[PDB]
């Protein structure tokens, strides 16, 4: 040809994308996305991995709807063990973990896990890597930190579409809360960022953004 480029093989995480889709019992492709997992929690003891784990079923009941069922089932079985079916966007596998919701641990909630109902379709692909961060930038003041932090969304507030750059087209004046994963803590946290295109520097956050295979949340070599 005339093209100065050719194809080559490279290693990429299995958690892509787009080799799909769903062998989940009860059908569906949606579950409860596990965000923040508090320390010394039932969730922690149960092995719930932030970002990578989706709760799909609890005691055989499929959770394909965003309702109070999950809360009710946990409420009804407080201080007793419940078995949860979990899907991993990392390993693309399903696993059953026992967990005991409780008030007897010093933390918020029965499981101590921040969750959100969405689909696990390519969930590993909707991540934005925080690159450099200027001093006294909106990003800096909010708590975003260079290279260690990954924005995985979102906090809605809410209507049509709206993922990150197409989020920050709104809120240009007013506050915005994000879900941020940190590769040191290996956990999610919620940060209040307020955009300002005239903050006195780069962009509206004053930070760099990476998207793609070079900017995913890291994966161990073997399961």
């Amino acid at each position: 040809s005339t093209s100065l480029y050719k194809k080559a093989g490279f290693l990429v995480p299995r958690g892509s994308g787009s080799s799909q889709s769903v062998e989940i019992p009860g059908g569906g492709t949606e579950g409860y996305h596990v965000l923040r997992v508090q320390e010394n929690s039932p969730g922690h003891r149960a092995g719930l991995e932030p970002f990578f784990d989706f709760i799909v079923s609890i005691n055989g009941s499929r959770l394909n709807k965003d309702n109070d069922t999950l809360k009710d089932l946990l409420k009804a079985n407080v201080e007793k063990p419940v078995k949860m079916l979990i899907y991993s966007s990392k390993t693309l596998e399903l696993r059953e973990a026992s967990v005991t919701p409780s008030n007897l641990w010093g933390g918020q909630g029965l499981l101590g896990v921040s969750i959100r109902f969405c689909s696990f379709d390519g969930a590993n692909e909707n991540v934005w890597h925080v690159l450099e961060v200027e001093s006294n930038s909106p990003a800096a003041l909010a708590g975003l930190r260079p290279h260690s932090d990954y924005i995985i969304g979102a906090d809605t507030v809410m209507n049509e579409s709206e993922d990150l750059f197409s989020l920050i087209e709104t809120h240009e004046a007013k506050p915005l809360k994000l879900y941020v994963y940190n590769t040191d803590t290996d956990n999610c946290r919620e940060v209040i960022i307020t955009p300002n295109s005239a903050w006195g520097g780069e962009g509206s956050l004053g930070c760099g953004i990476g998207y793609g295979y070079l900017h995913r949340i890291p994966t161990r070599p073997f399961e």
């Binding site: 809360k71 909630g109 101590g112 896990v113 921040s114 969750i115 109902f117 969405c118 809410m158 919620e190």
Partner: peptide, 6 residues
């Protein structure tokens, strides 16, 4: 949706 604690 929106995120919540369980």
């Amino acid at each position: 949706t929106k995120s919540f604690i369980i």
